[PDB]
Amino acid sequence: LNIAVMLGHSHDVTERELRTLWGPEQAAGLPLDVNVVALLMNRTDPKSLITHVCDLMSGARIHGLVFGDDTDQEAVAQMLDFISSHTFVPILGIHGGASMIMADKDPTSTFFQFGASIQQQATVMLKIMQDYDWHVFSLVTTIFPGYREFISFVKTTVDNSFVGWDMQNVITLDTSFEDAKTQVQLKKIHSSVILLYCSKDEAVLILSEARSLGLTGYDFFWIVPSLVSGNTELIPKEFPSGLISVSYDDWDYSLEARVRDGIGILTTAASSMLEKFSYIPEAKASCYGQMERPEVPMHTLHPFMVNVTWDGKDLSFTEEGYQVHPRLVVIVLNKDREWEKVGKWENHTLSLRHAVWPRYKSFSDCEPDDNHLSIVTLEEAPFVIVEDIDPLTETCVRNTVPCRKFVKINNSTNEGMNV
Amino acid sequence: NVITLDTSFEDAKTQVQLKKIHSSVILLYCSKDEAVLILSEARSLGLTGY
Amino acid sequence: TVPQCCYGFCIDLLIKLARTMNFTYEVHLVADGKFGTQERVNNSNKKEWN
Amino acid sequence: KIVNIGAVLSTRKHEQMFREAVNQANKRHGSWKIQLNATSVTHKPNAIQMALSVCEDLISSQVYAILVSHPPTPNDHFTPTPVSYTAGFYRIPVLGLTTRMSIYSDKSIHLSFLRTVPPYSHQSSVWFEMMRVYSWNHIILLVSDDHEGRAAQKRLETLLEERESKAEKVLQFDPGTKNVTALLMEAKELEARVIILSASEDDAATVYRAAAMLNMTGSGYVWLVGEREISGNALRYAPDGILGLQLINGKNESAHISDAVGVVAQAVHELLEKENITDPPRGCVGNTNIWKTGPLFKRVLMSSKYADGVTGRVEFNEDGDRKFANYSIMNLQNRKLVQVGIYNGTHVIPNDRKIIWPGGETEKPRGYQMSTRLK
Numbered sequence: 001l002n003i004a005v006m007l008g009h010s011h012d013v014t015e016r017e018l019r020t021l022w023g024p025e026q027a028a029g030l031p032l033d034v035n036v037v038a039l040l041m042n043r044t045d046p047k048s049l050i051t052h053v054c055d056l057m058s059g060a061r062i063h064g065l066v067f068g069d070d071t072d073q074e075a076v077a078q079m080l081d082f083i084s085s086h087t088f089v090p091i092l093g094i095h096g097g098a099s100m101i102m103a104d105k106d107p108t109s110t111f112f113q114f115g116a117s118i119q120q121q122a123t124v125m126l127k128i129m130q131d132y133d134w135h136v137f138s139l140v141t142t143i144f145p146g147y148r149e150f151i152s153f154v155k156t157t158v159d160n161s162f163v164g165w166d167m168q169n170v171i172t173l174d175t176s177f178e179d180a181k182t183q184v185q186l187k188k189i190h191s192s193v194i195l196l197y198c199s200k201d202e203a204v205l206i207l208s209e210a211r212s213l214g215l216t217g218y219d220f221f222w223i224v225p226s227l228v229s230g231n232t233e234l235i236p237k238e239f240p241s242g243l244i245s246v247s248y249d250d251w252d253y254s255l256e257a258r259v260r261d262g263i264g265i266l267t268t269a270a271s272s273m274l275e276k277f278s279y280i281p282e283a284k285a286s287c288y289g290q291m292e293r294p295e296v297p298m299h300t301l302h303p304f305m306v307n308v309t310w311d312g313k314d315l316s317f318t319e320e321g322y323q324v325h326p327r328l329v330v331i332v333l334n335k336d337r338e339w340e341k342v343g344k345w346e347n348h349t350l351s352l353r354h355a356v357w358p359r360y361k362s363f364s365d366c367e368p369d370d371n372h373l374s375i376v377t378l379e380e381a382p383f384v385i386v387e388d389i390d391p392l393t394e395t396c397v398r399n400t401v402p403c404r405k406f407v408k409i410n411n412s413t414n415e416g417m418n419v
Numbered sequence: 420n421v422i423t424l425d426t427s428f429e430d431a432k433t434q435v436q437l438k439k440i441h442s443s444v445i446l447l448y449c450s451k452d453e454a455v456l457i458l459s460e461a462r463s464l465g466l467t468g469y
Numbered sequence: 470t471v472p473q474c475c476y477g478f479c480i481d482l483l484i485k486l487a488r489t490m491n492f493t494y495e496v497h498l499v500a501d502g503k504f505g506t507q508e509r510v511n512n513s514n515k516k517e518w519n
Numbered sequence: 520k521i522v523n524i525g526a527v528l529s530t531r532k533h534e535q536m537f538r539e540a541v542n543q544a545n546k547r548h549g550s551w552k553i554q555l556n557a558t559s560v561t562h563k564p565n566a567i568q569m570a571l572s573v574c575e576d577l578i579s580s581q582v583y584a585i586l587v588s589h590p591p592t593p594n595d596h597f598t599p600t601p602v603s604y605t606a607g608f609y610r611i612p613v614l615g616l617t618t619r620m621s622i623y624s625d626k627s628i629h630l631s632f633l634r635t636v637p638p639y640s641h642q643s644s645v646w647f648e649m650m651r652v653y654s655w656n657h658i659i660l661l662v663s664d665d666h667e668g669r670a671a672q673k674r675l676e677t678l679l680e681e682r683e684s685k686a687e688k689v690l691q692f693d694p695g696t697k698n699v700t701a702l703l704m705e706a707k708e709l710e711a712r713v714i715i716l717s718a719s720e721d722d723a724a725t726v727y728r729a730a731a732m733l734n735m736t737g738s739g740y741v742w743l744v745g746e747r748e749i750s751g752n753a754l755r756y757a758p759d760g761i762l763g764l765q766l767i768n769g770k771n772e773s774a775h776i777s778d779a780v781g782v783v784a785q786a787v788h789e790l791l792e793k794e795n796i797t798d799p800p801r802g803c804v805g806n807t808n809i810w811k812t813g814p815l816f817k818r819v820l821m822s823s824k825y826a827d828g829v830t831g832r833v834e835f836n837e838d839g840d841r842k843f844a845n846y847s848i849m850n851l852q853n854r855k856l857v858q859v860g861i862y863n864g865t866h867v868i869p870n871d872r873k874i875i876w877p878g879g880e881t882e883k884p885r886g887y888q889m890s891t892r893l894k
């Protein structure tokens with residue numbers, strides 16, 4: 001019945017209010033018109049947040065609360081989790097501190113965020129590995145709460161994979177600033193592709209140790225997760241170019257694009273609720289005061305929004321609350337320390353690339369090398385049996401070499417995909 | 420190729436030199452004092468295996 | 470799943486093993502008729518035997 | 520050089536006695552002239568009221584830790600979640616009295632949570648030690664669909680995999696199901712004959728009633744019961760042969776609080792003598808920054824050792840929880856608890872009392888029974 005969107009000081013208040021007002025009026029008019037109560041402030045103090053929540057609650061029983069942020073603190077997610085554990089108001093996560101989803105999904109929680117979980121990032125990493133035909137793995141992780149389960153999941157997945165890449169034992173750094181065993185750990189790895197599961201501060205020192213030992217060669221490849229390279233505008237000097245990362249940012253999306261999707265999801269959920277029941281949900285009479293345990297008499301909105309379709313763009317959520325078709329735009333560090341879009345993952349949960357193989361040039365050190373020997377091969381004589389990628393098997397056979405060729409599409413245009 | 424230590428107490432290139440070797444049998448041509456620090460660096464990097 | 474009466478070569482060995490190893494065998498037939506190897510189904514990233 | 524620490528306590532007499540205890544601890548062993556300031560607040564059931572009291576008492580008084588005690592009523596949850604969430608803005612460490620739930624074990628949900636009670640994961644270590652000392656290899660597990668249960672199952676798997684041993688299978692339950700008879704039957708139809716129970720009190724009582732009515736209390740069926748599942752209806756609907764577990768000096772409140780506040784004072788002194796300390800903002804509104812001493816507190820506390828506690832030396836695990844706590848194996852004889860075994864760290868000390876088993880047998884059974892029903 002009422003929609004509230006929280007914004008910051010990044011943009012002007014008046015235009016944000018106007019666009020939020022005319023958002024739902026674009027198409028798919030609700031049977032009951034909704035209003036917008038937009039509150040904008042630079043600070044994100046918990047007392048200010050709870051006072052704003054109480055004011056929205058007093059605002060004719062607001063049913064939808066869109067929460068935005070501009071900082072990089074993940075504790076706001078915990079605070080909103082605790083608030084929604086009692087207010088029973090669904091909240092959609094937008095760009096800001098709520099972007100990073102790391103808290104466990106409470107059974108009473110009503111959160112369906114736009115963030116990307118680790119479980120749906122390992123598949124993207126595996127697809128990238130398959131595209132690059134890199135059959136060497138090195139799970140050099142760090143002891144953190146909740147990473148052992150991720151390591152078990154990835155090892156079960158690689159064991160279950162038909163490709164069967166080379167797997168090595170997890171050589172993890174026990175404690176930070178060992179200064180006596182870190183050298184041994186770095187000597188225990190003799191591969192080219194290393195995956196990292198740590199934080200930004202510890203990744204900085206790991207990269208410094210790698211630079212000291214000299215692990216930034218042409219053959220060396222590194223993949224950085226989303227939680228480490230989330231802050232794109234802050235690039236330390238100890239990060240060599242070519243750090244492949246998978247995450248989502250505002251290069252191809254905007255705050256308007258996110259809030260429109262959120263309000264569309266809310267409208268679809270309301271329509272699904274009205275399809276079965278004919279009762280308008282009611283919130284708590286008081287703001288936060290309570291003497292007995294709270295409960296929801298009517299059924300929650302979780303079973304209603306399990307299957308959501310928005311103009312052909314199916315944006316659903318899993319049982320926990322994670323999205324089914326996220327964005328996961330792949331970014332590769334530029335030669336001058338910049339991030340550029342090199343692919344997308346929303347294309348039917350697949351991977352895409354611009355077909356630019358060589359990007360690991362000697363930058364941190366000064367040592368040229370000639371590794372990528374360009375070869376030209378033809379198919380006229382019965383000496384080569386090269387065939388295109390088959391949908392079955394693992395897109396090729398176990399005994400083959402990756403190839404490329406320009407496929408013609410039109411009799412005039414020279415554009416050809418490097419399939 | 421002969422991977423030799425250019426100057427003593429580099430502290431920035433000694434690690435690179437020790438990473439440039441990936442064999443099991445190593446011959447040394449130095450003095451006692453420098454051999455002591457070479458063995459200390461090998462112990463730090465862990466080059467005393469079976 | 471009607472009961473059949475199958476016999477032949479391996480039955481004598483199975484009976485001998487049961488007699489000498491305290492075994493009570495219950496012979497069953499394959500519902501598919503094939504030995505079973507890796508096959509590709511929906512979510513082809515799964516290696517499950519049939 | 521004055522540091523003020525707020526406290527959250529249930530009743531007024533507890534507040535006064537703990538204030539006297541911390542005032543005395545300010546002079547115990549080695550101490551300086553001014554080290555601590557005694558402040559406390561009451562445990563308000565209302566969430567908004569308690570949050571307002573915390574903001575107006577601790578944040579506005581330059582605190583470094585929160586002295587929040589266990590809820591007075593064990594029946595109600597009243598989990599110390601809001602205090603930890605509020606302290607997570609500046610990575611402020613908190614104090615856990617007897618919060619044994621595994622939710623706070625992970626640092627992804629609670630950035631800085633410190634408790635003096637060992638987590639439920641130590642139950643898996645106790646089971647592993649008992650199997651090691653009693654020669655048990657094939658063990659089935661009964662874990663309900665809970666975060667704590669999944670954490671315990673993962674701990675058991677990662678502790679048993681190192682010996683090249685794997686559990687036969689693990690059954691998943693739900694909080695409220697009353698038709699677990701099929702799951703019990705399919706667990707019975709297995710080679711193993713040892714069962715571990717780890718769920719809520721009501722679910723444990725229901726599954727025990729189902730086992731009793733399905734004749735699962737016979738000889739050769741060793742039952743392992745967790746700490747929380749030996750109370751309530753367990754004391755009324757369970758015959759002998761129960762291998763219960765109980766924490767030694769766990770339910771006592773003042774036993775660990777004095778040691779905890781002493782450790783906090785020592786950590787404050789070490790932080791003062793180490794390097795520069797940043798101060799928290801006075802008001803609750805106006806600042807959203809992050810402490811620079813957040814990780815420093817964890818670094819100085821995980822490696823800290825103090826032998827002045829009642830349980831000898833004090834050590835913290837990677838999750839900032841109690842390490843190497845004292846456990847006690849509990850046995851039931853005619854609805855009476857009997858102490859036989861104790862735990863003090865990679866050791867077992869059985870007593871003269873004989874360990875009984877279901878069915879009246881006085882000898883340890885074996886989990887290897889070949890039914891010879893080879894399909």
Ligand SMILES: *[C@@H]1O[C@H](CO)[C@@H](O)[C@H](O)[C@H]1NC(C)=O
Binds near residue numbers: 491
């Ligand atoms: C197993 O074999 C023994 C002989 O060693 C025999 O006495 C016993 O009856 C057998 N058990 C069964 C179930 O056949």
Ligand SMILES: *[C@@H]1O[C@H](CO)[C@@H](O)[C@H](O)[C@H]1NC(C)=O
Binds near residue numbers: 771772773774829
């Ligand atoms: C808790 O322990 C302290 C010291 O060990 C003791 O003085 C006190 O009596 C104990 N509490 C109870 C209820 O026994």
